[PDB]
Design a protein around this ligand. Structure first.
Ligand SMILES: Nc1ccn([C@@H]2O[C@H](COP(=O)(O)OP(=O)(O)OC[C@@H](O)CO)[C@@H](O)[C@H]2O)c(=O)n1
Ligand SMILES: O=C(O)CN(CCN(CC(=O)O)CC(=O)O)CC(=O)O
Ligand SMILES: O=C(O)CN(CCN(CC(=O)O)CC(=O)O)CC(=O)O
Ligand SMILES: [Cl-]
Ligand SMILES: [Cl-]
Ligand SMILES: [Cl-]
Ligand SMILES: [Cl-]
Ligand SMILES: [Cl-]
Ligand SMILES: [Cl-]
Ligand SMILES: [Cl-]
Ligand SMILES: [Cl-]
Ligand SMILES: [Cl-]
Ligand SMILES: [Cl-]
Ligand SMILES: [Cl-]
Ligand SMILES: [Cl-]
Ligand SMILES: [Cl-]
Ligand SMILES: [Cl-]
Ligand SMILES: [Cl-]
Ligand SMILES: [Cl-]
Ligand SMILES: [Cl-]
Ligand SMILES: [Cl-]
Ligand SMILES: [Cl-]
Ligand SMILES: [Cl-]
Ligand SMILES: [Cl-]
Ligand SMILES: [Cl-]
Lengths: 410, 395, 411, 409
């Protein structure tokens, strides 16, 4: 009668008798053991189960094609609101079947921290794609984290606890690799430098004019107009009035309409909270709201340029060697020249920094003149961050997972 | 304000859990079980501590299934997989989490035996007891000594009383019985229901419905050219089969029915088509319908069966070693009392002389014990419940 | 880290503490009890489940007091206040922490009656059982049916067997008992010690101590010029009625015994405790002396000229003195008719006559010497069968065995 | 009718007991702690979380011993075998089955610090918080930020609040302190008893008792005709190096040379400096007095005190003697600061010295200082010490007495 089973035992009795929602958890913690692991089961969860998206979707769509043999499971917050191509079955987070899947699977494929109350036995391979080349410093490399209810010492403790269980961690480049090694308490031995499976499309399908054409019309865009994508990161600073009416984006849509409304159409990819607060009346067929569009890689494929500021997306869009524009209107805030960035923002990035929208809007007319002026910085930016990606990432992982559960079949 | 009972049920449950006892199911139920778990539209049935789909609960249930089909029905069995139940009723294995939930939720318990004391009969649940026959041998309270297995005469009665107090309604077959029940079971006449037994329903409504009698007989594989004798001894070879075969094999076939277990020792080889073992058959009342006479000794089947005003024979081989019954046994019963089988056989050879010779003693018996059965009984319980579950489904 | 049995105890003790149960002293005793607790020179005495300071324990201990004041002696009592103990021994109340400390710590347990199954007799301690006398009524296993509510015949026997399997040593007063014991108690002859009862010691060593007889005699305020009869019926339930407030005078007819024996006898009445404090001996003063309370019955014998009893284990102890006995069995023609509930043959091999009526007992009881003579026949042969094995050294044999035990347990 | 809370405690306790956890005594307490266990005649005392027999709980106790011997007194300690209590009182060890009994039964809790939140203060018991001094540094609610590990500033404050809500009465030294407690401790002013510290009664009743002074002086083997300087600096975490020193910044060696003849100096250091302090060759000059069981006595026999950022200044103030504030490290402390409730730069009873040589040459003439600052010294007394009338010990014990009378009916 072991002291660890006894604690998990009493915990569960309390959950069962008190009608706690976690009884599902407490049960799972008890019965869990190596023997439940069917080597041909794979669970996928993307961004903590909000979506069917990103790199697990592609590590998935690849395996569905070349390895339909296996049991595929997807984990979701709300499974009845998620469309999944293929054989895979879906599970609601924190339910019976959720802990089942996770107990039984021989491979965890995920792109974000998966919870700690889930048991990753010495027996299951947990593959971590993570979600992008870092620009803001993260995990260990942070300095202070006043995130409510926890302390910097403790939030790093738990994060280290998670990374410790990552059997594999994907990396898009030598710069991310060097960062993860420190930021994530990672051994170089465990890192795969293969590029992002979500980015696979950015190499393989970028000139597939039919695919480009579906996406365009799925979005209902003018057939004659080029496409700008604007994806500003979030700012607590700018949240006012409970979120009922915001000051028209500091980019000035009215102007953008005036100046580009004839050649261009602009895609707004905002944080989900600015999205259902942004009224786009009389911008119809000019500014298209694109914030909830499931797959971002597709939005890049049909974009002639990206306007962002401080985001890990510029590193993705980089693969297409198109012109970027960094509209850092609030840059004066951010530390006056911050080491809070792994890279030199001021110097090496593929486009101009604008602090005001009007200089930007004029330059945004003649894109071809922008591609010239910057072919220099753009190429150099491609060399450094985007050179690893060859569109074989989904293949590499799916094959790994295959190479893995063939040995295990003995 | 320390809740002293709850604390005991907890420790118990915490101990059943750690030592991995089978009763973990039970200590949970006992801890968790609140009056709020009760679903008005949920009714449980157990028959004979859950060996059968049989008897008064079957019939009460088969009735309710047709006229009140919307209620949720649960049956309790020792082994559900070996029992087949008609209709929307779901089965539950005993001592299983499903068993306890069932009994905790149920608004009505229907049984014909004692339900266990570890089960809690709340103030808002209605426990209907049908019991299981008209008593001959003394029972419950009225018993003198009962050196049962690992129990004392009082600790055994102390417990019966704890059981009979839980009974909200107790079904009675005949005045004779109600008088006995009131003492035997500590009961108050209010809670008693002199309405006959639901199980006997068919013994009035279907005694002449012939196609039915013909489905029973061919469901058993019986010779079309033979009268049927049913031997239902009672409790723990004697009748001389070899002799009954040489005496009766040309007019009769004989059904042998036990109460317990001896059955798989009756190697009836060479008595095929004559001695039919009918021990494991479900509905006894059916057997009576196709039975031309019945041989018994001290069973209470003798009162149920008497309802058909057929002949009975009481083969009391062990009467000498029995000195105490609620009625005068030597004197007034519907048939001859034989202590050897050899004169039983000869007098069983002509059934009609026995009928006339006893048609007076038969009627006297019918008019005492069977003058109460309508066949409406089954109905009357079904209704009672339905009624009892509109009240508890309103204000 | 946790074994299954200690868990059960742990949880019991939790229930006792939170719920404020008096048994808490026990649940604790049960957790904390271990072989390392034993003090080789601590010995515990209890007699008749702790009601008394009496019988074979008293004597085995009085011997050890004189010849071994070195050891720790603890006596057990229901009420240690109401009992007087001569010497070094300390008193402990049943069910107090002391009680359990004592029984946990003791290297030896001396007793003359079943000690509770809840106490743990470790592989470590020696439990000497003296028992309380030669059987006439069949006991323990040899019983047929035993309907004392709370327990069934096989449960009762199981519980008995458990307790005797714990007995390391079982004193025997004679081979008659040894025969019986072996069966009734599930005994292995190895463990039986035919040495005679320690309480009976003084029935040998001191049958003549005329300053001793005189000390007892004047303790009871007994007349100077009168012989002593002692009546000592067993308990019979037939007679309990009316709250036990007022009983029906003794069947033996006192008013008669007075008329007949008064001028020459004083009769000691040793009744049950319930008949005593419910018996009006007014006007019988100096003839009938109530004696049911007296602590030491062996002393009562030493000073008795005859002994009227009926079916009691006492005839055997008394037999040691080769004195006349009478067996006033006024209700014998109820007991079985022909009784197999007794081991010995009653109608035959007892040392005096059987009377069913008091009246001829009283007469015949007039000339003692004519009975001592007429019956010397049976009286001697009775002695040879039951009393031949006592030598007055029983206390000393048990004293020395214990000592010899806690000299070995001293290494 | 399921009692959910009781169930939780029952599980917790079973967990502890089976797991052989040292806290079994705690979880049993909590399981059974009923409002009935309280016995009106019982009073528990504890000072500074049971490290001492000292401070105001002491003086409240010693009073109630002279006038109310009737009651049951219990003292809580960490290590009772190492503490000595005059009188009837019984001693319990902390977290020991007796400890929890004591608080279970007691009708009154007397303490000068925080009592554990595991202990249940029933609405049946009166909890008297004497606290431990006029605050100079901002505390509890008024604190800006507390990076003290395991716990964040919100959760640290949240717990301090949980505690102060169980304070039935809270003692206050002065109007300044009362305004502060009302906020810093989330207090209802109705619950503040402005009577001064019982620990400071002796500073009023016994400053003139020459036989008392002598006992204290001969208890500390003090030379005879030497004046007495007392040094009591708060705890600097910065000044700790090499497993624990650079000779105290005050320079004893200079202090010896300038004062050796006429003064003896009492060092009241923090326990960790104290057993790191080598005094080889300052005997009969520098007396380590760090573990002296009663600080207010030390005040009585001191002709002046050198402190810095300590609450002690407020207490030594009742005596109107000179004070010096050797605040050498005042640089590091905010430059021009607001970390303190009062203006540390303006309205204290003495000179601020950042070097200990101005201090030395000034300590030479004690008459001169007294004259010089008599004004500042009086404006200090008027503000912070005008309450202490030295009947504080009495006022509290008489409330406790009054309090347990009303119970007995
Ligand atoms: N050989 C038998 C005897 C009886 N029964 C069935 O079991 C019932 C009980 O009959 P008893 O022989 O009297 O059994 P008992 O448990 O002794 O009940 C007697 C007492 O309950 C009277 O109410 C009968 O009505 C009948 O339905 C049966 O299947 N086979
Ligand atoms: O083991 C138990 O369940 C008893 N304990 C355990 C508490 N629960 C809380 C939880 O579910 O997170 C289990 C535990 O943490 O050990 C109750 C208590 O200490 O509060
Ligand atoms: O064995 C036990 O732990 C004690 N209980 C049995 C366990 N259950 C049953 C009960 O409630 O009677 C309760 C308990 O664990 O305390 C009965 C007893 O006191 O020996
Ligand atoms: Cl372990
Ligand atoms: Cl598999
Ligand atoms: Cl979630
Ligand atoms: Cl859903
Ligand atoms: Cl893990
Ligand atoms: Cl990232
Ligand atoms: Cl966290
Ligand atoms: Cl690099
Ligand atoms: Cl806008
Ligand atoms: Cl319902
Ligand atoms: Cl089954
Ligand atoms: Cl117990
Ligand atoms: Cl010893
Ligand atoms: Cl006592
Ligand atoms: Cl034992
Ligand atoms: Cl013999
Ligand atoms: Cl509980
Ligand atoms: Cl009191
Ligand atoms: Cl200590
Ligand atoms: Cl002390
Ligand atoms: Cl303070
Ligand atoms: Cl120094």
């Amino acid at each position: 009668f072991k002291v660890n089973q006894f604690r998990k035992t009493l915990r569960h009795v309390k959950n069962i008798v008190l009608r706690r929602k976690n009884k599902e958890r407490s049960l799972y913690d008890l019965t869990d053991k190596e023997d439940n692991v069917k080597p041909k089961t794979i669970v996928f969860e993307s961004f903590g189960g909000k979506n069917y998206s990103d790199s697990p979707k592609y590590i998935y769509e690849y395996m569905q094609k070349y390895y339909p043999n296996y049991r595929y499971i997807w984990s979701f917050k709300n499974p009845d609101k998620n469309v999944v191509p293929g054989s895979a079955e879906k599970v609601k987070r924190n339910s019976a079947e959720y802990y089942q899947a996770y107990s039984e699977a021989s491979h965890w494929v995920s792109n974000a921290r998966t919870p700690l109350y889930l048991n990753k036995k010495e027996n299951q391979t947990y593959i971590q794609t993570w979600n992008g080349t870092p620009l803001k410093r993260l995990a260990n490399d942070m300095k202070v984290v006043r995130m409510p209810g926890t302390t910097t010492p403790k939030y790093k403790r738990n994060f280290n606890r998670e990374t410790s269980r990552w059997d594999y961690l994907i990396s898009p480049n030598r710069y991310s690799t060097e960062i993860f090694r420190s930021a994530f308490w990672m051994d170089e031995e465990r890192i795969l430098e293969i590029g992002y499976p979500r980015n696979d499309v950015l190499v393989n399908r970028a000139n597939d004019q039919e695919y480009l054409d579906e996406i365009r019309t799925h979005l209902n865009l003018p057939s004659d107009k080029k496409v700008i994508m604007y994806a500003p990161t979030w700012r607590d600073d700018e949240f006012v009035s409970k979120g009922k009416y915001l000051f028209e984006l500091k980019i000035d849509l009215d102007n953008l309409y005036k100046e580009l409304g004839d050649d261009y159409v602009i895609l707004l990819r905002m944080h989900y909270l600015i999205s259902n607060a942004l009224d786009l009346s009389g911008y119809e067929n000019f500014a298209i709201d694109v914030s909830n569009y499931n797959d971002v890689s597709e939005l890049f494929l049909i974009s002639d340029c990206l306007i962002t500021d401080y985001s890990s997306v510029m590193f993705d869009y980089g693969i297409l060697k198109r012109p970027q524009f960094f509209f850092a209107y609030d840059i004066d805030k951010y530390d006056k020249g911050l080491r809070g960035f792994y890279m030199n923002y001021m110097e090496d990035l593929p486009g101009p920094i604008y602090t005001e929208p009007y200089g930007l809007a004029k330059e945004l007319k003649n894109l071809d003149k922008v591609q010239q002026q910057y072919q220099e910085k753009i190429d150099a930016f491609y060399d450094r961050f985007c050179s690893v990606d060859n569109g074989k990432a989904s293949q590499y992982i799916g094959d790994l997972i295959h190479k893995d559960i063939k040995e295990q079949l003995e």
